[PDB]
Design a protein around this ligand. Structure first.
Ligand code: DUD
Ligand code: DUD
Ligand code: DUD
Ligand code: MG
Lengths: 128, 128, 128
């Protein structure tokens, strides 16, 4: 591959932001919003990222929560499992744990992508 | 092993469903319920899967949320860490984020199993 | 490395507990509290662990929920992503899903650390 076994990103909207790690030791690639939305108090919402992704073979893309938002605004990430064979747009489902709404302006880093190494064997069913 | 390093599944109840990936690129193996239960609004519940599993060495089984259920019914997965040395029955703890109960009929895919590769070294305690 | 590619732990407070797996097949290293705190009903809180950690290269440290606490007290773990380049103190953000507060005495195992293998390639942006 030379290195086509990396994170293939395709911006769908011009407004989109290329995912990027914020440190040499960072685990995930920052993931920003492409729209202005409000995560309802005690409610959820799916934020468009405006990008599609192709995870490296042997891994899946887990949308994990950013420490900041979790801490300060009790924001959590629901679902978050992006299959290697997913060609659609990455949507980020946020859940407001707090009693007060949460504002999201375009461009904001609303989550982070982690390329988690998984194993995808077959199922050996044990009879007796 | 030839391939005994795959997902060993043992149905405990005849009603059980063998976990299975739904795509070539899917990350997890579908996980169905073996009973009819209701996930209480704003409450949780542990759904029996009726199966026991033996994860491949070098990984653990993370019970992750299905995108659909998360999106449409604000259903989330609590706990979800199945150790390689777990011989009991896989129980799936679902949490209803919504204001309205959620019905689960036997056979339904209530979560997905992901064989996540972990490293299990020893702890090197740094003194001074 | 010989084996300096293991979980490097540095107790910050004498009161701290060295993370440790509770089984040969356990996926995570137990993580205890270093203080007496209360996880507010329907609220969150960041529990100090009194330790700093250096994850092995090629992985990140995911703070996962303990099955017990999740089941019995509807306790969940928010955020939970500790980067390999994190030199600060591991803080554990717990979220009380239940209607009743949750007490945490010093020494208690409040979560578990899982050294999850990730891949950290570069981003190949697909133009046209
Ligand atoms: O539950 C958690 C989650 C994260 N961290 C630490 C690990 C990581 O190295 C650091 C990340 O801070 P940040 O990512 O630089 O700020 P942000 O999450 O807003 O990007 O916080 C914790 O101690 N506990
Ligand atoms: O937060 C999420 C979770 C999943 N997906 C995408 C990735 C995956 O490829 C697809 C999965 O749809 P599905 O699994 O086929 O439907 P279901 O989750 O009900 O099995 O949804 C997102 O965009 N955002
Ligand atoms: O959603 C879950 C989470 C865990 N387990 C199983 C897998 C694991 O092998 C066992 C762990 O029990 P424990 O870790 O020994 O008790 P505790 O979580 O309090 O440490 O529970 C489940 O069946 N379902
Ligand atoms: Mg939650």
């Amino acid at each position: 591959s030379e290195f086509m076994s990396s994170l293939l990103v395709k911006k769908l909207v011009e407004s989109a932001t290329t995912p990027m790690r914020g440190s040499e030791g960072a685990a995930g690639y920052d993931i920003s919003s492409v729209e202005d939305v409000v995560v309802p108090a005690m409610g959820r919402i799916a934020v468009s990222t405006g990008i599609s992704i192709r995870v490296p073979d042997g891994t899946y893309g887990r949308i994990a929560p950013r420490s900041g938002l979790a801490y300060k605004y009790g924001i959590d990430v629901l679902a978050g499992v992006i299959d290697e064979d997913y060609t659609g747009e990455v949507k980020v489902i946020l859940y407001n744990t707090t009693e007060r709404d949460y504002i999201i302006k375009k461009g904001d880093r609303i989550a982070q992508l982690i390329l988690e190494q998984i194993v995808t064997p077959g199922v050996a069913v044990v009879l007796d």
